[PDB]
DNA sequence: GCTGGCACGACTTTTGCACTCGACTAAAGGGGCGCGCATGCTGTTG
DNA sequence: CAACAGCATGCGCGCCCAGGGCGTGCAAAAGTCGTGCCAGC
């Protein structure tokens, strides 16, 4: 495929057998597409700002006849760039402006409108935009906003699993969940009665909520039950037959159907006697009277003459009633069915418990029920009733709620209003009773069908709607008798609630957090994370153990391996590779479509509900050129299960094997051989690695590294490419091809790389150019590498020659011994940049000034400062050297001889000023890499504040001058081209610049055309470019927006290189971790017969118990990987011909079964091959994808080509004794990391420090110098030893005994070592705090 | 409560705390520790001042305990961490700070003892006649004086005042057309409305006093009490609590409610050329003010120019 | 504020042997009380007892 | 609870006292006014609510505030908390002359010993050092001593050795489950930032070397030192005082 | 005889002092669990 | 129709962080600017 360019600098070798279909996606995409849909104009109105405008507008005021409306929004352009904005510490956002039409109408005049007026735009707030990479810069910090996965709106059902009543039942409760509004949850009693809860309220009867619907009891029972019939005329007593309505009963008498007995008394009820009466046509028949005594009347029945009193409803009929209804002359009687097998007599007992079935009594009952105390006002009832659900905006379940509400009840229409209705709640009660009847099951809450993701679009839209309603309840007051000032869309709108709400969200919020900036892969995995926590739900500690577990629908949606191992476990998950999300917020995952038994290359994204209906094959399975499965029985998934099916049954297939695994784990070689928990650690550990000075490409890897690097957006990637004009460390320009260009802009593309820059985790970000010079580049090729990147691959650690074997106990337990070589060669050396800021501000006593000079301070200390008082760039600073000095004046020192004497002798030395300065924190170190110094407008800063002014100005002028040199070169080419036609002076034209003063008039055509175009374009480009330089110049000389109580601002950056020591906390991809126990000299290590010592020695005994065998296979293939590079090393070092080198690399790439990577040489020729070979001199980078990876067999094969022993073990020699170890040993390259845990950050130690005002105990932690909690278990252990003195000095003397700490330390200094214990403060306190209740507690002698 | 970082405290150390810590650790007797504790409280955040000695002696209530006992102990206390501590008068401060020069300092020991012990009162102005007193000449004396001027004063190294006590402003005065326009930057609701009315009174003050003019135009609280009809004490309380913020000369505005301030500005102008005469002439300036129409007659308006740490009187 | 939470008088002084009202400032007296206020000197650890 | 810019803000417990005082003064004012029983009645109600809210913010519902709310805390909550003055005074003092670092292996270094990082002692032993310095006569005054150990040159490391000699230290780890979980050792100074722990005791501590961290504490006095030698040194207890069978067993 | 500091006066600034209840319309949360003790309604013993 | 015993529902313990977050007059008394007087150089 000829690849592209940088890829041809090093090609990894692919061992993956299965071909790929769907390319891995954008990864980040889930952030962008969210917020890209939140900022859009939409005609339909939903999806982003439009929806919050339409959520309110238009506003009606109060019977005003005048209103207000709005039209779109639009935007502004952001004032600062992302880098500027990040430096200055300003939040990165943009103006939101909206045109609101105002309509003013006359009173008492219907439909008449007197006038209308609208402001061009009103400016409301600034919405923060999003960078290209997925972060919102906010007060010069990145901050990723985390996606959340919440219980979806719609109708839900629950069995309770009968774990309450201790008898056991099935208690079926249904909750309705809106997008915003109240909750309705119907439940069952132990006695089997439905109850209504509203917002977790004590249970109410069932038929009151239904009684609010203007339904009479007749309509209640007739609507919620069967009709059937019963008829008795002159004691004929013929009832309608319902054989299909009953599956059983006990017959008390012989049932005769049309002069023939169908079923005798006690005869079989089985389907024989049923179909026997079915096939035969039978009308209404007579039954025994005693059977009716159990039936209950339905409709209200009254005599024709008198309609008084008895038998309204829900009354078991009596023998007294038969005479009355029979004498009344009613032929037909409609009664309830109620035969209990599936069916049940519910909702009738609810009527029994219901105190009154009247509407008004129910509304008053609920109205008085909501708030505990309430008067029966009757208005609360009408208000809350319509309000709590049927208001336009009060309760809204929205589109997910409505859709899933439709599919939950099996409605055909998927569209509807966002508010409930009578038939809605009635149908919910119908389905609820239906679940009790045995027909229908429950829903799994864990199912991903029932769990939806919200991303930053949807959440920002929420808070923006909130913020907008809080404005509208105010703006409603302008037309409220606020009368008329006209000019409405200017003073009426207050932007403060909108802005404070939006920047309140992004600022502070559980789901906006500081981004993990160590690693690219940390960045990535932060920005695709799905949290269950937050605003929308899962308070944790109370969540329970079931949302922790992997459910079978997480199949290629979340990940089963990447999860925090800490006490939020299964809570915070990570998107799987190829996962995406719907318009409805549900996780869907791709599959190849299989028609007949051939696999079509069309892919379909299936949602978790859609997925279970079908059959889906296995990621890794066989296949043919034709596309038929090799094996006739293929392992597949159906529904919650897996098993073998026939060839013709399965319609889908998994695309790639990467589907189950997340990107984090998609990086780990040999992940099969690893146990899942141990895999689970190592996935987490590659995040907390730390990029080192030189980035080594991993020598064995999955193939995934190109994506992550270039997606993470830490690399500099070339747009619209072409040949490289200019190169350098900080800057890289590309002269683009003539093909891709916008006409009239012309020009080239420039890239300014970012040099050393703190990250949120105080680590370096550094870009270093990959490309050379005079080299062609296409779009997508990487120009620079960010930190922990090599030529577009993700390189988080280093490769190390590992030997497995115990070595003198130094590698014991999980520790780890390393050759001094490693420390000399500086792999694992990592930079750290730390920020410190000084700010100079106005006090009550007057302004504060920075430096030159200070009271009571030596010249010694001041030697590293400048004329202006900031430290010279370049200084080495340690300990409490003064980084910026500053003076704070005190009050009014006047007179008396001593004051006048000190002022006379020393010149007062600026007198009242104090020593307040920016001294370095004690125990910190490092050179000063950069100083910023933001100032105030009109302070007249002068001094050295201007050096950054001139510096940035020269950089800007130099960057703009390039386009003027190239465009002026083009104009000079046109002028030089036109002068050739006539009046050509040749060299004389070149030696005479500035048009040769137009070179007279030449021809009239060249006069007017050449002088007009040349002079016009020349003066327009000169004046326009100078105008850009004047605008930028005005942007440079100014001062920032700033607090009223701050005058000028200075910040200093420091850098330290930190060198590995025996506190390293090194790890590997395979869940391997340790410390560095010791650094050995080089001669003390084990070495092979050629004298090459292993770098780093690790303890075999790790490996069986933990069952992570990725480690071992990694080593072996690593071994074999170096081997090839050793062949080539040795080959190029002997000055071999290009042809033979080509032959051995070609012969290397093509080894293995299958392996799908067809690269071959002869396509690229002469150099290009020498290039790569020199690029792979240090090892050949073999790449084994996740579950299609390299087999042992292929590893031994690869390894025999390197003249290495097939077993991967080798004889090694002791380094001290020179003696061979008995037994061979595995040696191999394994690829290590250094984790962000360093002991420099850990070792604390205090003796005596500052205490706490109350309780008078030492302070909490390091940095503040904690002392070290000695907690209750630790006391228990001493008591258990019976050592009561040690315990007694802990409790007292060395924590809260104040007099006794002093006496203690004074005796120690004197050599007494005696205690003199007293009474600890904190007891005294307690006695006061109990005296603060009316209890005395006193100590009695 | 606990388990959180409640603002329980820091327990920092001042100078007296630290001195007392230093006394705890030194071989004082039972009595001498009482004299030491008696002196360290007498010490000030400024160092040097140990206030009156004979009140230190008399504060103990006789019963023996002479002056010499407090004197010796006093010296030893004067010797603790910040070098010269306490003592009195700055003279003995510089003699204790000069007590340790290592004695290997060339020319400095002797000369420094003569200059610092005695005659240092005349070293204020310059050398001059003192050069004839000690017979020294050229840079021999100037280098010793370089050392004396290199000493610093007392303590104020312990300090423990990291708190700058910032202003935080309250209401911002965005400068308009050579003046100022309010914007207010940065029951309980009734108190907030009262604060807004105080900002409105500050805006009225903008109308009450010219910004561009020297100092501020004279105004009475009866003007702000005339505008909103509020009581004087209430307005003065709002302006006393909150502090108005302006781009230039921002202040609580409590002093903003052209009077004496204009005279102070005139005094500052007189001070600029007042350098030529050390004695100064506020009384002559008062005569000039009377000629200008002020009618000042050696009044405190002139005296204020002659006060406020002016060269006037002090130079005389 | 006088007669309030936090107040001098009851609850003791603020600075060690220095008290509000600016009189009998230090160590002149083991106890004493001003004429302006009830300030009882003696140390200020008494904010932890009274 | 003093603020960032000055202008102290009221603590949590103060609000309860302010409230009670407001209702007490208002009930007193309306009580001395001789007014109807309804409004002073509602004032009696309001004040019992107020005092009952200052003693326990539970008892009934809501309590809290409009501050972001939360129950606030009361004088009851000032006690009986999972972490409180009672918990702080109960087995739980936070503590002095202590420090903490990462563990490495000890693979020479006999049982009763313990690799203690050079830099880290020198702190733990400060008082002790100054004593020695004043004895030898290298410092006449406390400030001198202080300054030489601040400058940390030369004699001081030499004296550190002399200080540490035979002075038992005690190490402690993490969940302390049984009494073995803290034990006492003779330190041996070692340049490094980490603590070397002999293998054999890794059992007891339940510690591997994957980034576990130990605290260290310094017994002072005499009694305490002897209780460390004759009770907590690792060479006293080799047998597990549960089952009785040896710990120390080689793994 | 002139300048500076302080004392006396006027002014104009500071300070007295508080009760009604004011309220005000929503603002949301929200997947543990055991365990026990007491109050209350039901039920059966005579 | 009486008191007595039992079943059940509700309420309060535990575990455990978790994070911060924070106007309306008039009137009596007093602070200060102005002016004059007295003392120092």
Residue numbers in the entry:
A (entry chain C): 1 to 1341
B (entry chain M): 106 to 257, 259 to 292, 333 to 403, 415 to 473
C (entry chain D): 52 to 101
D (entry chain D): 253 to 503
Task: Please share excerpts from the published article on this structure.
Bacteria use sigma (σ) factors to recruit RNA polymerase (RNAP) to promoter regions of genes that need to be transcribed, with 60% bacteria containing at least one specialized σ factor, σ54, responsible for transcribing many stress response genes. The σ54-mediated transcription initiation requires specific AAA+ proteins (ATPases Associated with diverse cellular Activities) known as bacterial enhancer-binding proteins (bEBPs). DNA looping enables bEBP hexamers to engage and actively remodel the RNAP-σ54-DNA closed complex to convert it into an open complex. In this work we capture intermediate states of bEBPs in facilitating DNA opening and partial unfolding of σ54, and therefore link the ATPase activity to DNA opening and σ54 remodeling, which eventually lead to transcription activation.
Transcription initiation involves converting the dsDNA into single-stranded DNA and loading the single template strand to the active site to form the transcription-competent open complex (RPo). To test this model and to further probe how ATP hydrolysis induces or stabilizes changes in promoter DNA, we used synthetic DNA with differing degrees of premelted DNA to mimic melting intermediates during transcription bubble formation. Stable complexes can be detected with all the DNA substrates tested. Some of the substrates could support transcription with dATP or ADP.AlFx, suggesting that stable intermediate complexes formed on these substrates can proceed to open complex formation.
